[PDB]
Structure formats: structure tokens, C-alpha cells
Amino acid sequence: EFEAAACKKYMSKLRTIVAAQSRFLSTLCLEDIYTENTLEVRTPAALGLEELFSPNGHLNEDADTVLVVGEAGSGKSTLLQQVHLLWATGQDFQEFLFVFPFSCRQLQCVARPLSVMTLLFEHCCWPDVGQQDVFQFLLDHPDRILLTFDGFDEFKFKFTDHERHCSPTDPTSVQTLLFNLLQGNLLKNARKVLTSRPDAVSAFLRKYVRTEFNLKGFSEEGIELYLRKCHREPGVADRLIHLLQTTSALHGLCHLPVFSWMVSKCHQELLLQDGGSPKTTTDMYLLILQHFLRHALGPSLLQGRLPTLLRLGQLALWGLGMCCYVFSAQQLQAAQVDPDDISLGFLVQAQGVVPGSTAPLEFLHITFQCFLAAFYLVLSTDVPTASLRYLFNCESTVAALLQKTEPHNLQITAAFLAGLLSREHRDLLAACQASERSLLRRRACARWCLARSLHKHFRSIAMPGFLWLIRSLYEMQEERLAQEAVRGLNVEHLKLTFCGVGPAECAALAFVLRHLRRPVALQLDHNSVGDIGVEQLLPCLGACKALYLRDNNISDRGICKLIEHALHCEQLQKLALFNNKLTDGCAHSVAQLLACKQNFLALRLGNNHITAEGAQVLAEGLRDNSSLQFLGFWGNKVGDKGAQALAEALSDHQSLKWLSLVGNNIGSVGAQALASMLEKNVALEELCLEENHLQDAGVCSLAEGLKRNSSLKVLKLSNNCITFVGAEALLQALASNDTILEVWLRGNPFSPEEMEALSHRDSRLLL
Amino acid sequence: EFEAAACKKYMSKLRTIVAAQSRFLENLCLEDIYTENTLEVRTEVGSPAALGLEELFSPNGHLNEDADTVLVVGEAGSGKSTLLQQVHLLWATGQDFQEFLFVFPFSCRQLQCVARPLSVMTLLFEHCCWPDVGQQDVFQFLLDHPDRILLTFDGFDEFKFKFTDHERHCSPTDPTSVQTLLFNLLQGNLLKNARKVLTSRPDAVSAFLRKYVRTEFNLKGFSEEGIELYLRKCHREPGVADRLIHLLQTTSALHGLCHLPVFSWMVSKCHQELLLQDGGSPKTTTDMYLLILQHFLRHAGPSLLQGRLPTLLRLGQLALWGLGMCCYVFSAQQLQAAQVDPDDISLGFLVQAQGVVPGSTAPLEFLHITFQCFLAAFYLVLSTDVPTASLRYLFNCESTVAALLQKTEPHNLQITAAFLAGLLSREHRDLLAACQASERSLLRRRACARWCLARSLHKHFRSIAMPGFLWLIRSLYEMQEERLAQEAVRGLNVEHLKLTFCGVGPAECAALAFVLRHLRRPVALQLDHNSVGDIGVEQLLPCLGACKALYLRDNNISDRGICKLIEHALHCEQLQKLALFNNKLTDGCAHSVAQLLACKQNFLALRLGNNHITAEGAQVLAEGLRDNSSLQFLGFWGNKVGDKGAQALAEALSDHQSLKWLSLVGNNIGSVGAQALASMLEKNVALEELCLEENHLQDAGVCSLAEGLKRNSSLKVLKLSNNCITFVGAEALLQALASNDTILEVWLRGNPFSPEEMEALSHRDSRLLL
Ligand SMILES: Nc1ncnc2c1ncn2[C@@H]1O[C@H](COP(=O)(O)OP(=O)(O)O)[C@@H](O)[C@H]1O
Ligand SMILES: Nc1ncnc2c1ncn2[C@@H]1O[C@H](COP(=O)(O)OP(=O)(O)O)[C@@H](O)[C@H]1O
């Protein structure tokens, strides 16, 4: 009664506040700006925001802990802000009566020990009325509670922290408090959404996560939407979109929302188009720096506010080394940042829902904290050059802080440091030095470390940290240095799978890998390279003997652009494109590759959307090829008519050893065409024909061609609706054939008795 | 003698009964209610031509036994059952179709339920009407004069045929299955040359069946005028009709739904509630069926629904069982099994078969097939006996529920699915909130439906049809979730959307707007040969911004429509082309067309052929045409701008920088216009093609045209077929063309040339095309 009123009063308060805090950006109105983000669930299937607790079509209270993982600036904080807003405005996730948003970096700073009660009430929302009754309700209905913990990487746990605790009201450390939330010891079956950077997700943490999502940023289409949403003024969006389509390196950076935001903020400067456009990450953060400086001259401009920038950078560096990303009034006075420093706009009020007033401050984004720390490291006279060794591995307070800084922060900071010591950025910073050779003294140290950086790496064997060293070399923009770093590295296979490689990472890889002496087998499977990342990679393609681009969201436009350049690459021989968005549209380009390039060896094209129409177009070039060995179509649908055109081209073909047509919806019209091939063909050693409607009629004409064959060794026929007559028609033919090593008839309709008698009749038949 | 008397006695009985069964829908009398329905015949020259009810066996001006099987096709609630009832009544009362001595009406869903095998004799006599006298003689007469027999089979989709059914059978008296019986009726094995009218939904069996049909009609529903008539016929009470008609004119979405008679009926039934207003008016289909639900519940809000929940669930269960067993009529024994008491029946969703007398132990059926689909959806949403995996089977993406849904006919399954979506809308979920077992029960179902619907359009295009696409658009609409419509179109790179002959009306337009406005890349929307009309234009306006082109051929659009279209089109940067060939436009639109040309600086194409634009309007639009500097194509094929109109256009185009193509075919243009057009050609540097066929240009016209052509050097194609040009105007042209190096083709087909003159002309210049 009173109790009910009390809760109903609380639910209103909680909504009103959560709504208020979530409606606008720390960086216009969220409802009008939120552009949808490529959200993937790990299997790796895509899905929308609203399906966060129903990825596979049903609300499952089972997966009580959900984990969203993504790079810095991928849009995790913003994704939660939308969820909160959808909920607080009654639009979605209404299965929850209460949602409690938390900022882990803020909870990290809490000195005292706390209970579940003081967590919700003192660090989120305090019930105006009937506090004890409301808490009872929450304990009695935990399954109606969502908790969100933004930036889970910014906690620091301890073995002390890892202990059991079951009381809602008994105080304890914050860290052990979550441990027990995730354990289900507290608020069992309440839902928990955690966002994190990639390197902080753990062994003992992933032990608890029932569902894991990956936030991969804006798609190429997504970028345009964002810019159209942000720039309503007549035709301004159109000119930016045109600019990006004609400035590949920049267009690539924009896949990460934080960079799309920066381009929008800096449009005016960019549209002028004088001179050049930014291409590196440091380029962009320097542009945004100057945009800000204008509002509150070029190098003169920077010099104008140098004391401010140094004081912020000092705070920022202290922060990184103390794993502290939020700052209190007392700490700002200590760091001695006046309100002219704050007003510049790199420090913004902490965005968190916490009771009343008043909120501590934090950097506009974690990466601005890393950037300004790098800025300070470059220019402050308090920073000894010998301490920059700790940024790249190769003593003092500065060195002390860098040792204690989290690696993922340290890496960002290092890449910026490199970038700021580039030839051009050193001219820009020239007015801010103290000594006319001050920036050169620092470069001397950085360049030196970076030269040994890749040799140092491989000589202690991981691959995430390698990618960051490639990025630093890129940022510095020194070509002779990239040359020095790969000099002598005898690298054959480069494994970079699940490394979060996008276009901007591709740009850096091209910059460095093109100087490789011995040609490399580059493996980028399971990333988000895309069509733009292909364009960025092209400079190093000459240094590739193989290119593996599985699961990379590459389309016809990408592969055609790839093949265009691939034709002039003598080294390049293999090319895997399994599980992308290719269609018949690429078939003409693939035909050229096969026709013209006499060096080629392998070409896996499975799990795209190639049909009978395209199969024919490509088979034309396949006839004129005389080098190819492997060819894959697993999961396409070339069917009877496509199967036929390939078979006809391959009967004469001198080199092809392996061929997959699994799941291509092929009947006995194709089986016959393939039977003709086998009679003539002397090269083909393996033929995968699983998951097709070949039938007894198909297998029989296939066994017929096999009597005239003496090259084929492995013929895989699993799951074709083959019965014990097609099985025999095959066996009879095989009694004569002395060349065949294996024949698969797994998962087919046969009586066990039938199975008995096939296993005996010929000893090469499998299940 | 006795035989003749016997037949005559039968013909009377059959008439009397068929009349009796057909006179009422009861307070209502058919003769007083039947409002005429837009009936179209399919022609290979397709658009399809319109016609009246009475021309069902004479669509183009003559009777014919030749087409013994006629097929009327229409959407659910288009008015097919009612159309046959009128035919039967016209016949039985001696008014029309008197070429038939006997008419035998049948309900396919009822014949589907007959257990025993039957002969042609027991079909007509036992399941239609039994001859009081001389049964054997009467049957003989029927076998001897089959060409005087009409058979009507209402709701042909509700049969279920089999391979076993498809076998030969020639005896009239030997029993057999009902299904093989119709196979042989259609094949002509039985009662050869007897007439057969079949009504059906659009996607029911059509292969063997279409092989058999000679004439096919389409029933497209009430016109805008038709709706008013119906409401005036239904509401005689003082000024009540006037207030509903006003309500519809000021509530577009609803007014659009009413084009389908079943919705006009619902609005009439629910007028009292609608007139009260207060709550916003319904706009989706599920809105309407929920309103009619509450109307019924009142007589026997969420509290209201909760009151009779057990009833509604028992009906829905019956309904779902019915759909999955392809059974749409229910016997006393089956109702007791399904356990619907008389409180359930009395509610009013169950009704007697049309022929049957009230309250006899007669089987029952749902008020309409769509109410069976609606209540099935209702049950699917709320019953605790129903699993969410079952809902997956609604959209494609185990248990006895899943089993039934697999066996349900697709066309029924689609309706049911759209309702399901609708009932899980934000608002309708509040309304249903009182009826849930579990406070998160409706949300668990939405989670499944929303998920399937998100992938539904991607799933569709990735297996290539267009009828089933339109149903998915409708489900997304019904659910009324904007972020979902956004999700569904995400990543669909669609350029050209072909939706011709898809039966697209206003309510379909409403749904298309709702979804297509979220397209990222602008689309070429093609709705040629539908019934969009003026209301459908109004409903489409939200997605117009996402169109680069709009094609609205043969859509019965008037001045009111196009003016409303142009009003919004002016603020659409993407929209560039706009085809309106074969509609009801007149000079009245000319002012609006002038604005479009004047103001919209990036327009490209504007086809306006086969309307009723005259000289008067041609002048009004030419004003804006002068201030246009982007247009490329412009068409008037089949209008009548004539000499005065031709002149005003020519004058405006002489200065015009962009226009490449111009058609003035069949515009009744003489040599006064030809001269004005000659002046144009001298000056004009842009125009590359000029179509002037089917006009009275004459030798005098061609000569002044050849004169202007001497000064011209841009024009490439000049089409002059069928202008009564003789071998002097032909020469006057040729002389001029000896100098002109720019012209590629010149058409003089079908002209009064003698063959000798022809040979010479063909020979003199390669370019003249004869
Ligand atoms: N879905 C989105 N729509 C629009 N802008 C976004 C989106 N996600 C991120 N951004 C932009 O990028 C900036 C940083 O994103 P953020 O969510 O802080 O990334 P993270 O927290 O994962 O580092 C935001 O200020 C916002 O402007
Ligand atoms: N021509 C018409 N005139 C008046 N009312 C009609 C007409 N056609 C249909 N209706 C109304 O709509 C209802 C449904 O029509 P019906 O013929 O059953 O559609 P169908 O059989 O095509 O599904 C009828 O009961 C009637 O009230």
C-alpha cells in the first residue's frame, strides 16, 4: 500500500533522472543523432540494438550477464546511453522496472566500503520516500532489475577482492561487490550489461558471460546517415560525403564513430580543402585541437594557450599512471587547472547518473586524455627524454607513471607521441619548445626505439601489441624508418585474425609491410577490412604471396579493385574470400584474374552469393588458366547450370587438384556434366560434393565417368539422399579403380544392415 | 409431356429457393444495399479494361459458350461472395442471365466437408435442390442440355486437391470424390459446355486451374464514389451518412481502408463509436478489427476484453485448428468438441452458412474468413497453450501449434501474421495487458516477432515473389514500430521497385510509405497498373522524399491527386521523374504542373499521355515550361492539345536549354501547329526527338516543317507516321534533308503513298523510314 506508492514514486524518479542524463551528448539531441552501429554476436551473426537481450529471437533471462566489447571510440558509452533513454522514455526494454546506470571509473574512485543498498541508493538514485520498503521490493524482484556498468576495463581488481559475500546490506569493497553480482550471489537473475575495451576482457570474467557482443563501428552506409543527421544546412552533408569518397584514408578513419564526430565538428575547416586532408589519427586530433583553440594564427595559435595545454596534459598523464580517469574539485586545484583551462573544452562534466550535485570532471573522451598526455610528454621541460623509452619498452616520476599506466592506454599514447614527432607535426609544434633542438632530441629517442621495436617483438615468442607498433611507425610518417624496422625480419606468415583490423589499421600495415623483402602470407581473417580497407592495403599487395580475407564484409567493388592491382603483382598467388558479400557482379574480374595471371594458385570463394549466372562467366577465364590448383565454392549456389559450365572448362584443365562445390544445390544434371569431366580430366585429385540433391541417379552417372578416370583420389558425397542402389553402382565401379583413396557417404539414408554390407564390400567407404 | 412438366416444376423450385437464399445478407435487403464494385477483365494488351456486373459472360459485346470457365479473383473482403449472390438473385428473379435454365450455387468450403463420395446427380439434387417430381427425367434433360446450366463455386481456394483426385471420370451417376468431380467438370468430361463461375483469392491454385480458364476477371473493390453510396444506402437516419462521409474525407488512412467493402461494412457497423471520437481514429487494419471486437463485446476497455477472455480464447482455438486443417465450416459435433458453449456463439463471431435457415442444427462458420484469421492471431498472442517457436512459423525463420501453422494455407497464414504483428504493437499491447498470464507475457512474444520481421525483407530478396513482399511490408506497418521499419530496410540496396499488377490500393500505400521512407539510397518506385487513386497518393506522401522517380500509370488518379502530389514534390530534392500515363487528369491540374516546371529546378521527366488535357491547359503549363531549364523528356501521347496548344508549347521550347524528347502523338494537330513547331526548330538547339504521329498535319504542314528544318542542326529523329502526307510533302521534306547532316531517322509509315512513289522515296534517301 504505502509500500506500493513508495516504489511507484521511485520508479518515476529513476526514470525522470535517467532520461534527463541520457537525452543529450557530452559531445544536439540523442534521439536525432544516434546512427546505428554494426553490432555482432559471437557464434558471427549481425543484429540490431533492440535485440540486446534477445539476440536469437527470445527474451532469455538465462544469460543474465551480457558483454559488449569494442575499440576506444567504437560507440559503447553512446550505445548504453540510447538503451537507458529507450527505457526511461518507456519505448523499449520495458521488461525492467528499474535500470541502474553506473560508470565504473566513478565507482573505482569511491573510498569507503559499500553495500548493495548504498550502491543503488547513494551512488545512483536515492528514494525520496520509503527507502527500506523500496529496497525490499528490489530484493524480492531482482529479475526486474537491469544494471549497466560502462567501461568495465577501468576497474582494478585484486585477489583480496575475489571473495564470497552474500548480504545485500553488509558493506564491502566495490570490487568484491560486483564479483558477487556476477556470481549470482547478489540480486540473482538481475540483468547486467558490461561494456569494455578488447584487452581487458578476462579468463575468469568470460567465465560468467552468457552472451558476448562486438561493436565494430559505423558501416560505409552508416557514416553517410550520421553526416546527413548532423548537417541539415542545404547540401553541406553532400559535400562532406563527396569529400570522404575522394579521400580514402580519412573515409576509412570515419568507420570509428569518434572520428565521424570529429569530421562533422571540423567540416568547415575541411571543406576549405587547403592543403591536403588529414590521413593519420594524430592528424585528426591536431585538427580538433585547433578547432577548439580557434573558438576560445597556426603554430602561433598553439603557442597562445601552451600553458593551459601543458597543465591539462600533466593532469592527463598523472591520470593515466594512477588509473584515474575522473577528477574531483580538490584534485583539479592540486593539478592547478584554472577555469580558463576548463573552458577550453577538453574537460567536461562527468556524465553519470549519481545523486544531486556535484559531479567530478573527466576528459572529453579517454583518447583525448591519451593525446594530451602525449602532448605534455613531447613539450614539457619537466619530462626527461630518457623516460620516453617506457612508451616502447627499450627511475623518475614520469617513468614511474608510464610503468603503472594500463597497456591499452599506453599504446594509444605511444602512437600519438610518434605522430607528434612526425616531420610536419614537429614544424607545427616548433613555436612551443624552450630549446630550438628540443623536439629533435625527443625524436632521436623515439625513432631509435621504433627502429628496433618489431625485431624486439618477434624475438620474444602477442599480435595485438604488434599492430600498435605498426600504427606508431605509420603515425610518425617516416618512410626510411618503416624500411629500417622490417630490415632483416624474415617473416613468412603473418596471423592477424580477430585483431579488430579496420581501414585505418590497413593504411598502417600497407605503409610498413610494403618494405618487406621476402613476400608474405598475410592473414586478416575475421576482421572488418571492408572495401575501404582493401583500397588502403593496395600499396603492400606486391609484397604478398597470399592474401586471406575471410569474414571481412568485402563486396564486388572491393574485389574488383583488388584484382585490378593484383594483375600487376607477380608475388601474389593465393586469395581467400570466404564469407563476404560477393555476387555475380565480380565474375568478370575473377575471369580476368584466371585468364591473364599465369602465376595464380588458389582461390577460395565460398559463402558468398555467386549463382549459376556468374559461374558461367568465370568458367570462361578458367579454360584459359593453366596454373590454378585449389578452387572453392562451399556454400554458394552455382547449381546444375553452373556446375556444368565449370565441369566443361576443367576437363581440359592441366593443374587443378582440389575443387569444392559443397552446398551448391546441385542435382543429377550437374552430376552428369561432372561425370564427363572425370573421364577426360587427368589432374583433379579431390572433389567435394556434399550437401546437395545428387540422388541415386546422380551417383550412377558419376560412377560411370569414374570407370574411365584414374587421377581422382577423394570423392566426398555426404548428405545427397543416396540409397543402397546408388551406393552399389558406385562400389562396382570402384572394384576396378586402383587410384581412389577415400569416398564419403556419411549422413545418407541406409539401413544399418545396408551399412554392414557396404563397409565389407569396399574398405574405403566412410560411415 | 410429363418430362417437360417435371422440368418446369423443377425450374420453379430452383428459382424460388435460389431467390430466397440470395435476397438477404435480417434487417438488410440485398437489392437495397448492393453498391457496384470495380470489375476488370484481364487482357494481354495489359491495361485491363473495366465493365459492369451484367457483362460477366459477355465482356466484349457478345455471349460465348467458348469460355465455359470464368474466374473472378479478388482480395479477401473484395466482395466476391456478394457479387455471386447478386448474380444468383438477378437470375432467380428473371432479371438477367436468362440464357441459363438452371443455376446451381455451391459453397466450396461446405462441399469440402462432405464425407461420402458423390455423383453429378447427387451433387445437384442432394447438395443443391431435390426435384419434387420426375427426378430421373429432369436429370436426363440436364445431361441433354448442359449448355443451359450455370454452376457457381464460391471460394474455390478452400478446396484441397490431390494427385489421387486428378483422374478421369466420365459417368454422371457413378459416385466419386468431390474433387475429381470438379476436375472432370472443368475438363469438359461432365456437362460439356455448361458455364462455371469460380471465385478465388489471388494466390490460390492457379496452374492447372488457369490452364482451364478462358476468361479472368479482377474484383478491385469500391471506388471513392462507391463508398459514399454504400454509406448513404446503409444510413437513412437524418444526416448520419453525411457525418461519416465527412469523417472519412478528414481521416485519410481510414477512408483508404474503406475501398475494400469489408472495411466499409465495419465502419458502418461502428459508426456510433467512431462518431463519438475522443480517442484517435483507427488507421491500421488491426485497429479496425479491434474496434469491431469491442463493438461486439459492448452488446453482449481492456477490462472489457478481459471480461470475455475465456470465450475469445475458445473461439481463437477453434479458428486456429480450422486454419491448420483447412476447415472453415463447423458441425454441431465439432463445436461441442472445441467446447464452445452458446454464450460463445451468441457473442456473434460465428454465423450460419449462407443458404441455411436460422437455428436449425446447421453447421457454422466465422463471420468472415478474416475474422477466423484475426481470432487465430488473438489466441496465438494470449493463450498459455501457445509457444513462441510457433510464432516463428508465421514468418518463416515441434508442437501441435507449429504443426497446424505448417499446414495452414499461405494466404491465410499471411493475414494471420499481419494481425499477430498488429496485436503486438505498442498501443495494442497496452489494450491486451489485462489478458496475459504473466506481466511480461506479451513482451516475450514481441521479442520473437520483432526479431523475425527485422530479417524478413533481407530473407526475401536473398531468394530471387512481389505479392509476398507486399505482405511483409504490411506486417511491419501493422506493428507500428518505426525503429523496426528502419532495421528491416537497413542495408537493402534497392534501386528499382517493381510493384505492377500487385493489387496496390491506399491501405497498401500507407504501409509502403511507413517502410520505404527509411530507405537510404533513393528509389525508382513503380506502381503502374494498380488502383492507387487520389487517396493512395495522400498515403504515399511520407516516402516521396525517398523516391528518385515515381511511376503511376493506369492508377485512376485525378487532378486532386496530382496537385496534392506536386505540393509535396516541390520539397523533395531526390524526386526527378513522374509518369502519369492513363489517368483522369484534366486542364484543372495545369496550374500545379506549371509550378513544378517553374520552381523545381532539377526535374527531368514528365509523361502525361492518355489523360484529358486540351488546348486550354497546354497554354497554362507552357508558362512554367519557359522558366524551366532542366526538363529532358515530356510526353502528351493521346491528349488533345491541338493547334493552339501545340503553338504555346513550341513558343516556350524554342528558348529551352535542356529538352531532348517531346511526344505530341494523337493530339489532333494541323498545319497551324506545324508552322509554330517549325519556328521552334530554327531556334531550338537542344531538342533531339519529336514524335508527331497520328495527326492531320497534311502536305501543307510537312512543308513549313521542312522549312524550319533547314535552319535546324540539333534534331535527330522526326516521326511523322499517319498524317495524310502525299508524295509532294514527302519531296519538300527530302530536298531539305539533302542539306541536313544531323538527322538520323524520319518516319513516314502508314501514309497515303502509292507503291511506286514509295520505292522512289525509299531509294532517294536512306533516312526516310516507310
Ligand atoms: N551510435 C552512435 N551514433 C552517433 N554517434 C556516435 C555513436 N556512437 C558513438 N558516437 C560518437 O562517438 C563519440 C564517442 O563514442 P563513445 O560511445 O564514447 O565510444 P566509447 O565509449 O566506446 O569509446 C560520441 O561522443 C558520439 O558523438
Ligand atoms: N458489392 C457490394 N455491395 C455492398 N456490400 C458489399 C459488396 N461486396 C461486399 N460487401 C460487404 O462486405 C462483406 C464481405 O464481402 P464478401 O463478398 O464476403 O468478400 P469476399 O467473399 O470477396 O471475401 C459483405 O458481407 C458485405 O457486407
Numbering used by the authors:
A (entry chain A): 193 to 219, 226 to 241, 253 to 505, 515 to 612, 636 to 702, 715 to 1020
B (entry chain C): 193 to 217, 224 to 244, 252 to 505, 516 to 612, 636 to 702, 715 to 1020
Tell me what the authors wrote about this structure, in their words.
Here, we determined the crystal structure of the inactive ADP-bound form of NOD2, and revealed that ADP-bound NOD2 is maintained in an auto-inhibited/closed form through ADP-mediated and inner domain interactions of the NOD domain.
We crystallized OcNOD2ΔCARDΔloop in two forms (form 1 and form 2) under different crystallization conditions and determined the crystal structures at 2.3 Å (form 1) and 3.3 Å (form 2) resolutions. The structures of the NOD2 molecules in these crystals were essentially the same, with root mean squared deviations (r.m.s.d.) between 0.4 and 1.1 Å. Since we observed no noticeable differences among these three crystal structures, we refer, hereafter, to the structure of OcNOD2ΔCARDΔloop in the form 2 crystal unless otherwise noted. The crystal structure showed that ADP-bound NOD2 folded into a hook-shaped structure with dimensions of ∼70 × 80 × 40 Å, consisting of a NOD domain (residues 195–744) and a LRR domain (residues 745–1,020).
